[PDB]
Amino acid sequence: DLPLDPLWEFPRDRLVLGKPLGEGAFGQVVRAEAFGMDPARPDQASTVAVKMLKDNASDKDLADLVSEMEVMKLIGRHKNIINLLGVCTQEGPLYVILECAAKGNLREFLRARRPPGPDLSPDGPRSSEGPLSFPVLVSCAYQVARGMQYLESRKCIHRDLAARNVLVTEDNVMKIADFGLARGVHHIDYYKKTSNGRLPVKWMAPEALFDEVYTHQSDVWSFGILLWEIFTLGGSPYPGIPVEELFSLLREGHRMDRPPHCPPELYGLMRECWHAAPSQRPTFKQLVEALDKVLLAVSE
Ligand SMILES: CCC(=O)Nc1cc(N2CCC(N3CCOCC3)CC2)cc(F)c1Nc1n[nH]c2ccc(O[C@H](C)c3c(Cl)cncc3Cl)cc12
């Protein structure tokens, strides 16, 4: 139906669909096995993620997915983003084949790895030692920053940067996902709560929420929120604050408190990302450099 792009096109018969992963405003994602994604070894099996329309797809849903597909083509490959592996556009439903990150999104990754609390009977030399350590958390923050720095250089604005939009591979590499998505910024239900209880409005920069203005600096604001998520080990921002109260507090210039067990360096970066003037927030390049110094200092 769509034009053939031999650069990206992949034989759909070389895909074996398996367990569904998730569902969005447009399109669903299904885990699938792929054979010969590397043309050099045609019979080699690899696990991929296939994005496709729902059973409810309108012509707008198709247009959004087609748009997402083209964005993925242009943006190129980077270690810290979900990369395009191929597409299926000929003689069958539209598939957008993405990279796999085995461990799911960063929020659930962190929440599932919170330290055992005080109610655990000590067993072994590492009773009080959890899966997560400070340098790894900084690494997570650093990688997202460098990934966003790449997206920015490709003139790509995410518009909903958050821990649930960052995917974690088998080797704990951060990969930013859903960055080229048409999110319908002119009709956002600011009170809409997701199925898992998320209020996406708590990630919006003031200029984006109030003036519908999106820049790379508005992403920097969101990265500040994402930083807060990381060092709360998957906490929800503005704890116990309903959207109505969020509106007024933001107009009053209210900001989140410094989370427990979070060094002043990183809460400093958070507050810098949350400066009212977008020009007074650090660039992603500066964020990468600032987080690098912290990471190198804690990596003997
Ligand atoms: C390709 C290997 C794989 O299966 N990875 C995987 C499993 C999952 N899940 C979803 C939760 C599900 N568990 C099952 C047990 O009960 C709790 C949920 C299974 C594992 C979530 C992911 F984000 C991923 N990671 C993704 N890798 N590549 C993706 C491409 C699109 C994608 O989108 C889905 C809708 C998604 C999901 Cl499901 C969660 N957060 C963000 C996104 Cl963008 C996720 C991945």
From Swiss-Prot:
Principal subcellular localisation of the protein: membrane
Gene Ontology terms, MF aspect: ATP binding; fibroblast growth factor binding; fibroblast growth factor receptor activity; heparin binding
Subcellular location: Cell membrane; Endosome; Endoplasmic reticulum
Alphabetically ordered keywords of this record: ATP-binding, Cell membrane, Disulfide bond, Endoplasmic reticulum, Endosome, Glycoprotein, Immunoglobulin domain, Kinase, Membrane, Nucleotide-binding, Phosphoprotein, Receptor, Repeat, Secreted, Signal, Transferase, Transmembrane, Transmembrane helix, Tyrosine-protein kinase, Ubl conjugation
GO biological process, one term: positive regulation of cell population proliferation
Entry binding sites for ATP: L21, G22, E23, G24, A25, F26, G27, Q28, V29, K51
Keyword Transmembrane: yes
Effect on the protein upon substituting P260T: In a lung adenocarcinoma sample; somatic mutation
Effect of substituting K51R: Loss of kinase activity
Any one of the GO CC terms: endosome
Tissue: Expressed in gastrointestinal epithelial cells, pancreas, and gastric and pancreatic cancer cell lines.
UniProt modified residues of type Phosphoserine: S121
Disease: FGFR4 variants may be involved in the pathogenesis of various cancers. It has been found in prostate cancer as well as cancers of the breast, colon, head and neck, larynx, lung, skin.
Family: Belongs to the protein kinase superfamily. Tyr protein kinase family. Fibroblast growth factor receptor subfamily.
Function statement: Tyrosine-protein kinase that acts as a cell-surface receptor for fibroblast growth factors and plays a role in the regulation of cell proliferation, differentiation and migration, and in regulation of lipid metabolism, bile acid biosynthesis, glucose uptake, vitamin D metabolism and phosphate homeostasis. Required for normal down-regulation of the expression of CYP7A1, the rate-limiting enzyme in bile acid synthesis, in response to FGF19. Phosphorylates PLCG1 and FRS2. Ligand binding leads to the activation of several signaling cascades.
Listed name of the protein: Fibroblast growth factor receptor 4
Encoding gene per record: FGFR4
Range covered out of full length: 453 to 752 of 802
